[PDB]
Amino acid sequence: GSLYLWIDAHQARVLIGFEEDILIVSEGKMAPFTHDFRKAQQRMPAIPVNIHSMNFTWQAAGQAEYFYEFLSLRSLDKGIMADPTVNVPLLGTVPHKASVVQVGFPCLGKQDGVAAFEVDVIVMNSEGNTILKTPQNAIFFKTCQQAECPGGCRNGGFCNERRICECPDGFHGPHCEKALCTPRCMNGGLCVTPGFCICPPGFYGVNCDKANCSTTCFNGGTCFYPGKCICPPGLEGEQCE
Amino acid sequence: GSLYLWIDAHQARVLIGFEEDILIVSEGKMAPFTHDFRKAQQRMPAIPVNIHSMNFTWQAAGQAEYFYEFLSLRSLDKGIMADPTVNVPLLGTVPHKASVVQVGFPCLGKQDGVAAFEVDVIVMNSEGNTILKTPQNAIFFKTCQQAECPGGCRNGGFCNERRICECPDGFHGPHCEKALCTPRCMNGGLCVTPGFCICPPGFYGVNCDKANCSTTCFNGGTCFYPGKCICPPGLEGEQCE
Amino acid sequence: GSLYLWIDAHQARVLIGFEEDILIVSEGKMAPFTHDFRKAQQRMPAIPVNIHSMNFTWQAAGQAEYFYEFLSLRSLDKGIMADPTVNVPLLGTVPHKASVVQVGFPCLGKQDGVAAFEVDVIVMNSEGNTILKTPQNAIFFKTCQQAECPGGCRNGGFCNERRICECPDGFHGPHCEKALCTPRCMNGGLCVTPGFCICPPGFYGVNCDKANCSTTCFNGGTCFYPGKCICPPGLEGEQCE
Ligand SMILES: O=S(=O)(O)OC[C@H]1O[C@@](COS(=O)(=O)O)(O[C@H]2O[C@H](COS(=O)(=O)O)[C@@H](OS(=O)(=O)O)[C@H](OS(=O)(=O)O)[C@H]2OS(=O)(=O)O)[C@@H](OS(=O)(=O)O)[C@@H]1OS(=O)(=O)O
Ligand SMILES: O=S(=O)(O)OC[C@H]1O[C@@](COS(=O)(=O)O)(O[C@H]2O[C@H](COS(=O)(=O)O)[C@@H](OS(=O)(=O)O)[C@H](OS(=O)(=O)O)[C@H]2OS(=O)(=O)O)[C@@H](OS(=O)(=O)O)[C@@H]1OS(=O)(=O)O
Ligand SMILES: O=S(=O)(O)OC[C@H]1O[C@@](COS(=O)(=O)O)(O[C@H]2O[C@H](COS(=O)(=O)O)[C@@H](OS(=O)(=O)O)[C@H](OS(=O)(=O)O)[C@H]2OS(=O)(=O)O)[C@@H](OS(=O)(=O)O)[C@@H]1OS(=O)(=O)O
Ligand SMILES: CCCCCCCCCCCCCCCC(=O)OC[C@H](COP(=O)([O-])OCC[N+](C)(C)C)OC(=O)CCCCCCCCCCCCCCC
Ligand SMILES: CCCCCCCCCCCCCCCC(=O)OC[C@H](COP(=O)([O-])OCC[N+](C)(C)C)OC(=O)CCCCCCCCCCCCCCC
Ligand SMILES: CCCCCCCCCCCCCCCC(=O)OC[C@H](COP(=O)([O-])OCC[N+](C)(C)C)OC(=O)CCCCCCCCCCCCCCC
Ligand SMILES: *[C@@H]1O[C@H](CO)[C@@H](O)[C@H](O)[C@H]1NC(C)=O
Ligand SMILES: *[C@@H]1O[C@H](CO)[C@@H](O)[C@H](O)[C@H]1NC(C)=O
Ligand SMILES: *[C@@H]1O[C@H](CO)[C@@H](O)[C@H](O)[C@H]1NC(C)=O
Ligand SMILES: *[C@@H]1O[C@H](CO)[C@@H](O)[C@H](O)[C@H]1NC(C)=O
Ligand SMILES: *[C@@H]1O[C@H](CO)[C@@H](O)[C@H](O)[C@H]1NC(C)=O
Ligand SMILES: *[C@@H]1O[C@H](CO)[C@@H](O)[C@H](O)[C@H]1NC(C)=O
Ligand SMILES: *[C@@H]1O[C@@H](C)[C@@H](O)[C@@H](O)[C@@H]1O
Ligand SMILES: *[C@@H]1O[C@@H](C)[C@@H](O)[C@@H](O)[C@@H]1O
Ligand SMILES: *[C@@H]1O[C@@H](C)[C@@H](O)[C@@H](O)[C@@H]1O
C-alpha cells in the first residue's frame, strides 16, 4: 500500500484545537479509530456553525495508480443544508503530490437547526477493485444557524452575523452579483482577473466541463483520463476487452 | 536512496531567522555540513529559552521501506532539564508522506543554566542495515531559565514570565490539572472533546500502548508493524528464519 | 510520468487573491491552459510593484530521476530590471521532496516603468531527453517603480516607500552593509549567526561554489551530482561512452 488520506494541522486547529495531522488512511489501510467506524461516528459531533468547509489532504506516494469515485453527496435535510460540495471532480485519479480537497457544507440560512448528510467515496486499484471505501450508510451532521441578509446572498454565499454576504471564489460585492468570469469555473478551475478559467488536468472549455480522451472506452466504460480507464467486471485492459 | 530529513521554513524562522528549508538528509545521504559533524557541533549554540520544542520533517519518497529507532534520549543534566521527548514511537517505519516530529526539551524551571543532552537515532534498510545514524556521543545543549509559578505546573508544563502555566496537549487550567481524557494519549495520540485517544497506526487502547502483530517475530525479534519485522544478524526474512 | 510543478496556495493569495494550488505540470504533462502557451501569455499581466519574488514548488514523486537546466535568465530591459535570480543552482536534479524555488525579479529603482524578461528552463529524463520545456522565446513582464533611498541599498536591496532598505538574506542595517558571513552564500546556502554557509547537496566551501564528483564525466560532459551525469548525443551511460 501507498495511499495516505489525512487532515492538515492548520485545519485541525479550527475543528479540534490541537495543531497536528489527523491521519485517516495510512499505507493503504484505515487508521485504528476507523475500524469500529460506528463507535467513531458517536465520538464525532455536528459540524459547528463557524466551520463552513473542511480541508482533506490526500496522495498516492508509490508508483501505483489509485482511482477515487464520489458515489453519493446527498443532504438528508434539504430544507436546512444543501447537498455537500467538493472542489474536485467526482471521478478521477488520486494525485501523487499532496493535494487538499475542499468539502463545503452549504447551509441555506432560511432555517435554523442541525442537518444530516452522506459522504460516500471509493478508492480503487489499477485492476479496478475497491480497497478503501466509506462503510455502508455513513451519516454525518452539520449545525446551521438562521441568518438574514438584506436582498439575499447569491451563488452559494452565507450571511454573516455582521449582515455581510460571504462571497465564494469568482464572486464579490454586497449580494455576490458582481462576478469576474461570466460562467463560474467548475471541477477546481480558477478565474484570473481578465477572466476565463484555469482548467484542471483532464478538462477544457470556459467552465471546465468538456473532457478529452486519447483512448475511447468500450463496453459501457467511463473515461476520466486519456491514460487509464475503468472497466466493468469480466472485461480487463486499457480499452476494456 | 530516497530518504529526506529536514527542518521546515516556518520552524527555521524561529531558530535562525531565515525562512527556508534546512536539509539534513538528502537522497539517503547526509548534507555537506554534516560530514565534519564535530565542526558542525561547534557552529550550533544552546537551544534558546524561548524555543521549547523543535519540528523535524521526514519522508521516504521511494517504494523502499525505511525503519527508524531512537536508541538514547537522555538528559546529562537531569536537575535542570528532563529527558528530551518525541511525539513519535521510539521504534517504527518512516512515513512515505511528509510528517513532522516534535522534539520537546523539558526544562524543570527549578534551576537556571544550560543543560546538555543526547539524541541517538538510527535509520535502517529493508534488509536491516544501519545506513544513516547519529555519529558517536552527540551532545547538544539547551538554555533553561528559572521561573516560579504559584502552585506549580503539572504534566510537563513550563511557567511563563507572566506567571501562567503553558499547558501541553490534553491539559488546561491554572496548574494544568483540568484534563479532557483521563489517561494522557501516547505515541502521538490525540484526545477529542468527549474523550479517549485517536490512536496512531500500529497502536490501540485508551492510552495507545497495546500493539498488535499479524506475524509473530521469532528468535528474539521486536515487532512494530504487522507488515515488516527487525531480525538479528544471521537470521533473515519476514518471521526471522 | 511523475513530475509536478505548481504554485503554492500561500503565494497564490498574493498574486491572484484565491488561496489554491496553481498546477503547471501534472503527471509529467503541462496543464490544459499551457497548451496554447501564447494565449496564456496574454492572460498574464506584468508582475506588480508589490510582488518582488515568486515561489514555485516542484517534485519528482516516482522512482524516476529528473534533471533540470536553466538555459537563459536574461532581462531585456537592463536599465529598469536586473537579470532574474533563482535560489537553486542552474543545472541539477529535481528533488523527490516538495521544494520551493524563489524566482527573484530585481528592480534597480533608478528608473520607473515596466521591464520584460526571459525564463528558459528544460526538464530531462534519465536517458537525457528534453520532455518538458519553456516554449520558444518566452517573454514575461515586471512593473518597477522609481524609489530613492539616502545612501543607496547594497547587495540586491530594494528601497521601500518608507525610505528603508529591504535587505536580503545574510544582510542587515540601513544600507545593507552589515553582513553576517563575509562572502554571501550561493546556490541556496544559508549563513548561521557565527558565520559560514550551510552548503546545499553537491556543493562545498565558504560560498558553496566548489563541486565534487565521484565519477568524472568524459567527452565534454558536465557534472552536477556524483550519482548521475549528462551525456551528449551519440554517447550513453554513467561516464558517457
Ligand atoms: O481602496 S479601496 O477601499 O477602494 O479598496 C481598493 C482595492 O480594492 C481592490 C481589492 O481589494 S481587496 O479585495 O481587499 O484586496 O479591488 C476589489 O475591491 C473593489 C471595490 O473596493 S471596495 O473597497 O471593496 O468596495 C472592487 O471594485 S468593485 O467590484 O466594487 O467595483 C474590485 O472589483 S474589480 O477588480 O474592480 O472588478 C475588487 O477586486 S476583486 O474582485 O476583489 O478582485 C483593489 O483593486 S485590485 O487590486 O484591482 O483588485 C484595490 O486596490 S487598489 O490598489 O486601490 O486598486
Ligand atoms: O468566554 S470565555 O472567556 O469564557 O471563553 C469561552 C470559550 O472557552 C472555551 C475555549 O476557549 S479557547 O480555548 O480559547 O478557544 O472553552 C475552554 O475554556 C473554558 C474556560 O474559559 S476560560 O476563559 O478559559 O476560563 C474551559 O472551561 S473550564 O475548563 O475553565 O471550566 C473549557 O474546558 S471545557 O471544554 O469546558 O472542558 C475550555 O475548553 S478547552 O479545554 O480549551 O477545550 C470555549 O468552549 S469550547 O468551545 O467548548 O471549547 C468557549 O467558547 S464558547 O463559545 O463560549 O463556548
Ligand atoms: O531591542 S532592540 O530594538 O535593540 O532589538 C533587539 C533585537 O535585535 C536583534 C534581532 O532583532 S530582530 O531582527 O527583529 O529579531 O538583533 C538584530 O538587530 C540588532 C540591532 O537592533 S535594531 O533594533 O534592529 O537596531 C543588530 O545589531 S546591529 O546589527 O544593529 O548592530 C543585530 O545584528 S547582530 O546580530 O547583533 O550582528 C541583529 O541581528 S540580526 O542581524 O538581525 O540577526 C536581537 O539580537 S539577536 O537576537 O542576537 O539577533 C535582539 O534581541 S535581543 O533579545 O535584545 O538580543
Ligand atoms: C475525502 C472524502 C471522504 C471524506 C468525506 C466524508 C466526511 C465529510 C464530513 C467530515 C467532517 C465531519 C466529522 C467531524 C467534524 C468535526 O467537527 O469534528 C468534531 C470535533 C469538533 O470539535 P468540537 O467538539 O466542536 O470542539 C471544538 C472546540 N474544542 C472544545 C475542541 C476546543 O472534532 C473531532 O473531535 C474529531 C475530528 C477529526 C475526525 C474527522 C474525520 C471524520 C470523517 C472520516 C471520513 C473518512 C471516511 C471516508 C474516506 C474513506
Ligand atoms: C529526527 C531525530 C534526530 C534529530 C534529533 C537530534 C537533534 C536534536 C537537537 C537539535 C536542535 C539543536 C541544534 C541547534 C538548535 C539551534 O537553536 O540552532 C542554533 C542556531 C540558533 O540561532 P541563534 O544563534 O539562537 O540566533 C537566533 C537569532 N538570530 C541571531 C539568528 C537572528 O540555529 C542555527 O544556526 C543552526 C540550526 C540548524 C541546525 C539544526 C540541526 C542540528 C541537529 C542535527 C541532528 C541530525 C542528526 C540525527 C539524524 C541523523
Ligand atoms: C520554475 C522555473 C520555470 C518558471 C519560471 C518562468 C516564469 C517566471 C515568471 C512567472 C511570473 C509571471 C507570470 C504572471 C505573474 C502574475 O502576477 O500573474 C498575473 C496575475 C496577477 O494578478 P493581478 O492581475 O495583478 O490582480 C491581482 C489583484 N486581483 C485583482 C487579482 C485581486 O496572476 C494570474 O492571474 C495568473 C497567475 C498564475 C500563472 C503563473 C504561472 C505563469 C508562468 C509559467 C511558467 C512555466 C513554464 C516554465 C516551466 C515549464
Ligand atoms: C511546530 O512546532 C509547534 C510547537 O513549537 C507546534 O505547535 C506546531 O504544530 C509544529 N508544526 C507542525 C506542522 O506540527
Ligand atoms: C487531451 O487533453 C490532454 C490535456 O488534458 C492533452 O495533453 C492531449 O494532447 C489531448 N489529446 C487530444 C487528442 O486532444
Ligand atoms: C515565499 O516567498 C517569500 C518571499 O516573497 C519567502 O520569504 C518565503 O519563505 C517563500 N516560501 C517558502 C516556502 O519558501
Ligand atoms: C492489527 O492492527 C491493524 C491496525 O493497526 C489492523 O488493520 C489489523 O487487522 C489487526 N490484525 C489483527 C489480527 O487484529
Ligand atoms: C483550508 O480551508 C480554507 C477555507 O475554510 C481555504 O481558504 C484554504 O485555502 C484551505 N487550505 C488549503 C491548503 O487549501
Ligand atoms: C562528494 O561530495 C559528497 C557530498 O556532496 C560526499 O558525500 C562524497 O563522499 C564526496 N566524494 C568524495 C570523493 O569526496
Ligand atoms: C461510468 O462507469 C461505467 C462502469 C458505466 O456505469 C457508465 O455508464 C458510467 O458513466
Ligand atoms: C527488540 O530488538 C530485538 C533485536 C531484541 O533486542 C529485542 O529484545 C528488542 O526488544
Ligand atoms: C555542460 O554540458 C555539456 C554537454 C557541455 O556543453 C559542457 O561544456 C557544459 O559545461
CATH 3.90.780.10 fits C1-148, yes or no: no
Pocket perturbation via mutation, ligand 6, pick of C44, C100, C117 by most ligand atoms within 8 A of CB: C44
Task: State whether residue B43 sits within 8 Å of chain C by CB.
Answer: yes
Half-sphere exposure of B149 (CA within 13 A, CB side): 22
Within 8 A of B87 by CB-CB distance, chain A residues are: 20
For chain C, give the number of residues.
241
- Torsion angle in degrees (nearest 10) through CA of B54, B204, A27, A136: -130
State in Å: Cα A219 to ligand 15 middle: 52
Q: Which has the closest alpha carbon to A126: A66, A69, A202, A70?
A: A66
Nearest residue to A240 (alpha-carbon basis) of A222, A213, A214:
A222
C-alpha cell at C14: 498574493
Domain ranges, ordered by start, for chain A: 1-148, 149-241
- What atom in ligand 10 is closest to the CA of residue B201? 5
Residues C107, C148 contacting (CB under 8 angstroms): no
Sign of the torsion angle spanned by Cα atoms A221, A224, A225, A228: negative
> What sign does the CA torsion over C15, C17, C22, C24 have?
negative
Report the amino acid identity of residue A201: P
**What is the residue type of B190?**
L
Nearest CA to ligand 11 atom 9: C19
In angstroms, the Cα distances linking A239 to A92, A154, A203, A219, A230 are 17, 43, 20, 9, 9
Q: How far apart are CA A10 and CA B131, in angstroms?
A: 34
- Which chains sit next to A, with 3 or more Cβ pairs under 8 A? B, C
**Euclidean distance between CA atoms A21 and B87, whole angstroms:** 12
Q: Give which of B58, B198, B204, B213 to mutate to test A binding, by max A Cβ within 10 Å.
A: B198
Q: Across B145-218, where does the E strand assignment appear? A: 158-159, 165-166, 171-172, 178-179, 190-191, 197-198
CB contact at 8 A, B72 and B118: yes
Q: Which ligand is nearest to the CA of C91?
A: 15
Q: Shortest Cα distance from B176 to chain C (angstroms)?
A: 35
Q: What does DSSP assign to residue B13? A: H
3-state percent helix, strand, coil for chain B, nearest multiple of 5: 5, 30, 60
- Report d(CA C29, CA A204) in Å as an integer: 15
Please name the method used to determine this structure. Answer: X-ray
User: Do the Cβ atoms of A146 and A158 come closer than 8 Å?
Assistant: no
User: How far does residue C136's CA lie from ligand 5's centre (Å)?
Assistant: 45
**Taking CB atoms and an 8 Å limit, are C199 and B32 in contact across chains?**
yes
- Per CB-CB distance under 8 Å, the chain A contacts of B204 are 32
DSSP per-residue letters across B17-43: S--S-EEEEETTEE-GGGTTHHHHHHS
- The rounded distance, in Å, linking the Cα atoms of A51 and A36 is 26
Are A84 and A105 in contact by the 8 Å Cβ rule? The answer is: yes
**Residue C180 CA, closest ligand 3 atom number:** 37
Q: How far apart are CA C70 and CA C90, in angstroms?
A: 5
Is the separation of the CB atoms in B226 and B218 below 8 Å?
no
Q: How far is A48 from chain B (nearest CA, A)?
A: 13
Q: Which of A29, A43, A62 has the CB atom closest to B194's CB atom?
A: A43
User: According to the 3-state scheme, what is the secondary structure of C106-150?
Assistant: CECCCCCEEEEEECEEEEECCCCCEEEECCCCCEEEEEECCCCCC
Four-CA torsion B94, B100, B105, B106, nearest 10 degrees: -100
Tell how far CA B44 is from the center of its chain: 19
Taking the CA of residue C53 and the nearest CA in chain A, the distance in Å comes to 19
CA of B152 to the centre of ligand 7 (A): 25
Of the candidates C159, C73, C62, C60, the residue with the CA atom closest to the CA atom of residue C108? C159
φ, ψ of residue C226 to 5 degrees: the values are -65, -5
Do the strands C171-172 and C178-179 form a parallel or antiparallel pair, or are they unpaired?
A: antiparallel
- Whether the Cβ atoms of residue A135 and residue A118 lie closer than 8 Å to each other: no
**Ligand 8 pocket residue status of A212, Cβ below 6 Å:** yes
φ/ψ of C132, rounded to 5, equals -115, 130
Grid cell in block for residue A125:
486499484
Instruction: List the Cα angle A126/A130/A132 in 5-degree steps.
Output: 110
Q: Do A201 and C33 touch (CB under 8 A)?
A: no
> Using H for helix, E for strand and C for coil, what is the string for A33-90?
HHCCHHHHHHCCCCECCCCCEEEEEEEECCCCCCEEEEEECCECCCCCECCCEECCCC
| C41 three-class SS | helix
Q: What is the DSSP letter of B75?
A: B
Q: Which residues pair with A3 in a beta bridge?
A: A60
Q: What is the DSSP string of chain A?
A: --EEEEE-HHHHHHHTS--S-EEEEETTEE-GGGTTHHHHHHS--PBPTT--EEEEEEEE-SSS--EEEEEE--BS-TTTBPPPEESS-SEEEPPSS-EEEEEE--B-SSS-EEEEEE-EEEEE-TT--EEEE--SS-EEEEEE-----SS---SS-EE-TTS-EEPPTTEESSSS-EESSSSPP-TT-EE-SS--EEPPTT-BTTTT-B---SSPPPSS--BS-SS-B---TT--TTTT-
Interchain CB contact of C204 with A (< 8 Å): no
Phi first, then psi: what are they for A58, rounded to 5°?
-150, 155
> For the structural domain made of B149-241, what CATH number should be given?
2.10.25.10
| Index of the ligand 2 atom closest to the CA of residue B172 | 41
Only one residue has cell 516556518, namely B10
Place of cell 508509490: A62
Which listed ligand is nearest to B68 at the C-alpha? 5
Q: Is A137 left (phi over 0), alpha (psi -120 to 50) or beta?
A: left
DSSP states along B128-164: --EEEE--SS-EEEEEE-----SS---SS-EE-TTS-
Q: C132 - beta bridge partners?
A: C123
Ligand 2 contact via B164 beta carbon (within 6 Å): no
- CA distances B239 to B67, B90, B202, B228, B231, Å, are 16, 21, 18, 9, 8
The number of angstroms, rounded, from the C-alpha of B23 to the middle of its chain's C-alpha atoms is 17
DSSP 3-state of B74: coil
| Per-residue burial over A103-132, b = 16 or more CB atoms within 10 Å of its CB, e = otherwise | bebbbbbeeeeebebbbbbebbbeebeeeb
Question: CB distance B31–C201 less than 8 Å?
Answer: yes
> Can you tell me which atom of ligand 1 is nearest the CA of C17?
43
Tell me if A109 sits within 8 A of A158, measured CB to CB: yes
CA of B55 relative to ligand 9 center, distance in Å: 18
CB of B241 within 8 A of CB of B218?
yes
Nearest-angstrom CA–CA distance, B48 and A46 = 42
List of chain C residues whose C-beta atoms are within 8 Å of the C-beta of residue B56: none
Q: Give the span between the Cα atoms of C96 and C65, in whole angstroms.
A: 8
- What residue type is assigned to position A156 of the chain? G
Cα(C36)–Cα(C53) distance, integer angstroms = 25
The ligand with the least distance to the CA atom of C133 is: 6
Contact status of B36 with chain C (Cβ, < 8 Å): no
First to last CA, chain C: 27
Q: Is C58 exposed, middle or buried (CB count within 10 Å of its CB: 0-12, 13-18, 19+)?
A: buried
B221 Cα nearest atom in ligand 14:
3
Nearest CA to ligand 12 atom 11: C214
Report, in angstroms and rounded to the nearest whole number, the Rg of chain C calculated over CA atoms: 19
CA distance A141 to B171: 27
CA distance C7 to chain A (A): 12
- Counted residue by residue, chain A has a size of 241
